Each structure stands twice: as structure tokens, then as C-alpha cells.
Ligand binder design. Sequence first.
Ligand SMILES: C[C@@H]1OCC2(CCN(c3nn4ccc(-c5cccc(Cl)c5Cl)c4c(=O)n3C)CC2)[C@H]1N
Length: 473
Amino acid sequence: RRWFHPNITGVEAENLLLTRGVDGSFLARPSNGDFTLSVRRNGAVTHIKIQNTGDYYDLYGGEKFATLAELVQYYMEHQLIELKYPLNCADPTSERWFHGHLSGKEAEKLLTEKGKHGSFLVRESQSHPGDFVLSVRTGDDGKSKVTHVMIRCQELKYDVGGGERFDSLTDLVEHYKKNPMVETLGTVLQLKQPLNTTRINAAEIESRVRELSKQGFWEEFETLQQQECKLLYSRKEGQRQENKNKNRYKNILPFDHTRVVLHSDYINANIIMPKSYIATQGCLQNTVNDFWRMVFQENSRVIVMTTKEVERGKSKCVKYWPDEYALKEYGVMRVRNVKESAAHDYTLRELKLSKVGQGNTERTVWQYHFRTWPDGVPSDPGGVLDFLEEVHHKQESIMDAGPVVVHCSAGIGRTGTFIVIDILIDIIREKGVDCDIDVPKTIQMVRSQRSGMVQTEAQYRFIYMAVQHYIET
Ligand SMILES: C[C@@H]1OCC2(CCN(c3nn4ccc(-c5cccc(Cl)c5Cl)c4c(=O)n3C)CC2)[C@H]1N
């Protein structure tokens, strides 16, 4: 994902494409959640705007995508003008192993307290300015050790004192991950995993929120984004001709290996397993019956709607339930709206779902429709937390209840935010504040089951704020 330049300006982008790029070279850069796709063509540099308010990436005049990597992969194969040569960035800021300003004793303390065999980091050198240090832990009292390797910078190239000279710290790390250094007496300096400094004890959430607010939220979030290229899983079923009109957006698709299979078998939906979840899109008129088939088949008893039916005049979640006290059939599924109850932040609809001709199949489905999410993110997490707390208790009170359905819009943004908050709060509810939480890792685990779960930095920070607020109360 080297084609994304985090700290690049617009003038710097045009200069990079014109001096170190050729026609068809491209890069992406932040703006502000506005983004810019700068492409070189016919000796010129055209700029294309990409907007993400929290639901999806919207390319001006293009299509809508779940991740910039999926956007770039799409146009490097299909419709825009020409994306041929990604211009790679040498900035290590977004790497999981780069820590820039970091003391050598603090780095030894980190690797000792939180590291394992093969855990490593790269930092700016304590003494010799402009150089870097690669600190790596190895071993299984005295059974393990921390080894430091000086990384010199000479003529914009990097080396470990001998051998190849690398154009960037990343090339050096990748090289020495595949060909690890061997010490004199046999010790192999294997670079297995970056040091996990994002996993924190739950009681220390407020301290970390203070550090990240000094921002640090941005640096951690774009480090999470840099790894999305590892989540380009297969999405073939949602591209077949018969399933194109079942997707709200043609290029926001469910991963084949986690999608819900209807027993046609397609719906834009994925099972999220950390209580499990079904993350899906807002209904279309032609998928309402498939939605209810899914709810019935998976034995789901709770539904979370993340958006209003309409926001800013645009349909975000098509109505798929009957009016209060009414009864309606959706294909072979029959649904009665038994009762609606109005809270401040949401509406609760008690629905009874059954298959036609089989009254024995009847079950109650509790529909929780959140309605006070702004047209960015909420400034107070209390409403969302109280909402999820009630949702969790309803789910826990129903024996053998299936996965919780969370949906609306494209089903990746607010949907991923609610689900990740619910996963994290679930750990603290059962195990108290004396437990480990890891917000980036939890999101990456969920993004490997549906594309682009959690869309924006504002949602990423809101997840932290929600977890902090829950732990305080
Ligand atoms: C400003 C410095 O540069 C960035 C910086 C590097 C260290 N760091 C960090 N950020 N981060 C974001 C997501 C993930 C992640 C975790 C588990 C699995 C996967 Cl797949 C991922 Cl992507 C990680 C991660 O592991 N670390 C260690 C904090 C931010 C700063 N020191």
C-alpha cells in the first residue's frame, strides 16, 4: 500500500509524479475525511476527489468502495483516466514497527514487558541523529535477550553496516524479515511480529486516550489502514451477473469465505465472529424477501438498524417491516409488527416472524432502530452505549438466539463501529477492567470478515471514547 502518502501535500504530489513518475503514475493522499487520487497523464497531473463521511469512499465521477485498496485494485483492472504505476512512498510513519522518537531504555522496557520471540521495532537513533535502531527480542531469567542493530543513513540510503543499501527503512525490514541476520555465535535475529504496543489493560484506557489525543489517533489509524491490502479476499459471488442488482453499491461486496449463504443463495451480508453478528447492507426493494429469509434461517432474534430510513433526502435504509399492528408477507416469510416503543435515541419494534403455512415456526424478532446518529459521529457515546447495553441483555435473555443482525447504508461504516464497540464492551462486561483490549487488532479481525468495517478516523476515535466512557461508568 505504498501508493498512499500520509504526510504529502498537493504541491509535493504533483512534483513527485512529474519528477519521479511517468504517465499513468498515481498516488493517494489525505486532504479535511476528504482524499485525493493524483494521477499523471499526458504529462499533466489530474486530481480526483474521494470523500468518506463514514459510510463508504465516494470517488467523484467514479464508483463507491469499501477501501482505497479495493478502489485502486478495481481501476487497475477495469471506468475512470489510466492507473498504471503506483508511486511508492518511503515514509515509515504508518508501519506497525516504526516508533520514530523513542528512547532506547523505553524500547528495552517495552520489548521486555510486552514482547516475545521475534518481536521487533525500529526507532530514531538516540545519539547519532538521522540514523535508526532496530531493536529485536529473541529467546524462549536470561533465557531471552534484546538485540540492537544500528541502521545508518548515508546518501538517502539505509544499511546495517554492510551488504545491501536500501532506499527506505521498509525495504530493509522486508529484506531482513526474509533473510534474517545471524549473529557470530549462531543467534538468528528473526523479525516475526511488530511489538504489540496497542494492546492495553482496560483500566489504563484513559491514559492511552490522553496520549493519543496529543494527533496520535491519526498515526495509529493510518497504521491500521496501511494493512488493508492484506484483506483483499475473494468477492466473486457478489460480482456474478445474477447478483449485481442485489448490492446497494456494485463494488461493495461480501467476502466469499464469510458471506451468508441462503438455503438463490446470495445476500450482501457477512457473519462476524470475534455472540456473533451478521453485518449487512440496507435493504433494496428486491432484497427485502432475502433479508427475512436470512433472519429466519440464521435464527436471529435481534436487529440493529444504524441509520434513519432517510437522511439528507437520500434513502439509507428501505423500510422492510410492517406498520405497527399490521401483518405483511415477504415471500414465504410472514411478519407481524406487534408493538413499537419509542426511546430517546432509538425505536424498538417487536416483530413476530414465521414461515407461511407453518405457525410452529414463529419467533419474536426485536428490532432496535437507532435514530440519533448525526448526518460524522456522536459527540457523546452514552446513547450508543445505553443502546448496545439494552441490545445485549435482550440477546442474552433469548435461549439459542442466533447472530445479531446489524445493518443500514452499505453496512461497513456505522455497522462496523457498533459491532466493534459491542465486541470490546462485551469483554469488559464479563471480565471487568482487569483485562486486555486491543482496538486496532479487533478492527483488523473484523475487517477480515467484511470489507472496510469501521470507515473513518472519527469512528476509530469514537470507538476509543465509547470504551473509555463505559469503563468510567
Ligand atoms: C507514529 C508511530 O507510527 C505508527 C505507530 C506504530 C506503532 N503503533 C501500532 N499501530 N497499529 C495500528 C494498527 C495496528 C495493528 C495491530 C494488530 C494487528 C494488525 Cl494487522 C494491525 Cl495493522 C498497529 C500496531 O500493531 N502498532 C504496533 C502505534 C502507531 C506509532 N509508533
